[PDB]
Design a protein around this ligand. Sequence first.
Ligand SMILES: *Cc1cc2c(cc1C)nc1c(=O)[nH]c(=O)nc-1n2C[C@H](O)[C@H](O)[C@H](O)COP(=O)(O)OP(=O)(O)OC[C@H]1O[C@@H](n2cnc3c(N)ncnc32)[C@H](O)[C@@H]1O
Ligand SMILES: *[C@@H]1O[C@H](CO)[C@@H](O[C@@H]2O[C@H](CO)[C@@H](O)[C@H](O)[C@H]2NC(C)=O)[C@H](O)[C@H]1NC(C)=O
Ligand SMILES: c1ccc(CNc2ncnc3[nH]cnc23)cc1
Ligand SMILES: *[C@@H]1O[C@H](CO)[C@@H](O)[C@H](O)[C@H]1NC(C)=O
Ligand SMILES: *[C@@H]1O[C@H](CO)[C@@H](O)[C@H](O)[C@H]1NC(C)=O
Ligand SMILES: *[C@@H]1O[C@H](CO)[C@@H](O)[C@H](O)[C@H]1NC(C)=O
Length: 479
Amino acid sequence: ALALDGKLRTDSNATAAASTDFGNITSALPAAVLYPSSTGDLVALLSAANSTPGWPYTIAFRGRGHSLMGQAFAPGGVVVNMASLGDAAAPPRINVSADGRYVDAGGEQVWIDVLRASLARGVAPRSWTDYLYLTVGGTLSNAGISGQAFRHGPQISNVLEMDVITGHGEMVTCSKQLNADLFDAVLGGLGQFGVITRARIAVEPAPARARWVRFVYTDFAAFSADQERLTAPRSFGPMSYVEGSVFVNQSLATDLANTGFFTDADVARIVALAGERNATTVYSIEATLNYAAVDQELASVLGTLSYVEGFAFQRDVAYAAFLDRVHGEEVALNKLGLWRVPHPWLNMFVPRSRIADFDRGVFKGILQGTDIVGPLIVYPLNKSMWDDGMSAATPSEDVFYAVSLLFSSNDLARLQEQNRRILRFCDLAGIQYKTYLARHTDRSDWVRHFGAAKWNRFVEMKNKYDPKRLLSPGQDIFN
Ligand SMILES: *Cc1cc2c(cc1C)nc1c(=O)[nH]c(=O)nc-1n2C[C@H](O)[C@H](O)[C@H](O)COP(=O)(O)OP(=O)(O)OC[C@H]1O[C@@H](n2cnc3c(N)ncnc32)[C@H](O)[C@@H]1O
Ligand SMILES: *[C@@H]1O[C@H](CO)[C@@H](O[C@@H]2O[C@H](CO)[C@@H](O)[C@H](O)[C@H]2NC(C)=O)[C@H](O)[C@H]1NC(C)=O
Ligand SMILES: c1ccc(CNc2ncnc3[nH]cnc23)cc1
Ligand SMILES: *[C@@H]1O[C@H](CO)[C@@H](O)[C@H](O)[C@H]1NC(C)=O
Ligand SMILES: *[C@@H]1O[C@H](CO)[C@@H](O)[C@H](O)[C@H]1NC(C)=O
Ligand SMILES: *[C@@H]1O[C@H](CO)[C@@H](O)[C@H](O)[C@H]1NC(C)=O
């Protein structure tokens, strides 16, 4: 049926394309790839899976395959090419609500397109990822974090409702008011319970511009204290976005220039600063204020901070330009053949109480004396803005840090060992981190990830919504 209609492909090019991901480290050939033209085809697939005894195929939902470690693979299974849902010219896959208070987006849609559609209506999502060519369904299945998350929560905290087709092949609309168990499970649910075909995303009146600053520190305590200051509840301070990066001495200039923010002169200034202080590591807060009035507001905020005087750097850009800043990096890196490489990224949430220890062991320790290519991103998040009833797992402390070591790779083996070492350091130090964007490979690691209570709920939802354990096997939780 589907196949005859050409929707279910088994040819080598189709399975090949669905067998690799952004991580470019692991690969797994599916048996087939579904190219659905409508949600009806997804229902048909999942209904078949549900009602067929001896159904052979796990099923993954490939957004854009930005997964790092095969999370979007269905080894010997069926990969759904979600992008196909957005092929048709009509009907539209992104609808800003009549009142401009939300935007309905197909799960297959990429956030860059959600942004463009929203802006046409004078609005925009309030919580982002740093990189916009990811799908709605994909980020919502994880959490979706960027510099706004401290005040707006992750993207999963900014969803009104969703349409989900479960493992039972049943199309369900869910929200806090209806099928809340599914709603909660799916958000941060790692594709385990059903495919998100539509997510209803909160929006706010779109700011036109962003004042965009980088603040430089050689003192991690001051750096982290200032980040916590900027993201502390008042309701929140004025900053619209707060992240940070770490630059190890050995690749200081290179990594500084790689931000795409500092001029070569800025870089020289910072290297000199680091040199005059014999600093092994430099830190930079990255913050924006969406909007003469900006000048004084910015001055007032900056006046509460303790970055190195003379080391506040300022850009002023259109809001959309800031949001899509990373696309330019990709376009550039790709031209140098440095985008499509192995990405042994290490992402975790580190409890505030141990972030200084992490800094000591990793940034001042393990990572020292290496040539780092890729941002080392560090910034605090407020647990209060996360819904613990959702599948996403975060540390127990009110404040935890997103730590994203975006290593680009004989380097691969070294980098992989380095990550094991970082993890070993954290385990030995008793740092109660949570991984983000990582898949574990045994039960005990996953149970530890979620914690006993949340794991048990996770399993309860799996039994309810994907009893055959077909969905997103590449997460290696139930597969
Ligand atoms: C590639 C990358 C990723 C990335 C990023 C920058 C780069 C260049 N920056 C991020 C950031 O700033 N903040 C953040 O939270 N995440 C960031 N990412 C990681 C990204 O979120 C993940 O890669 C995520 O998977 C989204 O990527 P994508 O949309 O391409 O999804 P996928 O990898 O193909 O699939 C991931 C898992 O989710 C399941 N899935 C996919 N779509 C659905 C729907 N519609 N419904 C239910 N489940 C879905 C897949 O089965 C897979 O398990
Ligand atoms: C955007 O809104 C339109 C309604 O105008 C939706 O289009 C309809 O979609 C349903 C089911 O997908 C179809 O049966 C109808 O034929 C469509 N109507 C029109 C006017 O073409 C569309 O689904 C919405 N998109 C999202 C993601 O919610
Ligand atoms: C957590 C945080 C960030 C990411 C990925 N963002 C990202 N990816 C690539 N380049 C960047 N430059 C600035 N931000 C980024 C993934 C998980
Ligand atoms: C990684 O990408 C290269 C292309 O540079 C490709 O040849 C290789 O097969 C990929 N490996 C994996 C595991 O995706
Ligand atoms: C799922 O399968 C059960 C029997 O195994 C059947 O009763 C139910 O109607 C099915 N649902 C769908 C949507 O296929
Ligand atoms: C920084 O690294 C450079 C080589 O890249 C080295 O010359 C210098 O000694 C390092 N600085 C410190 C403070 O260790």
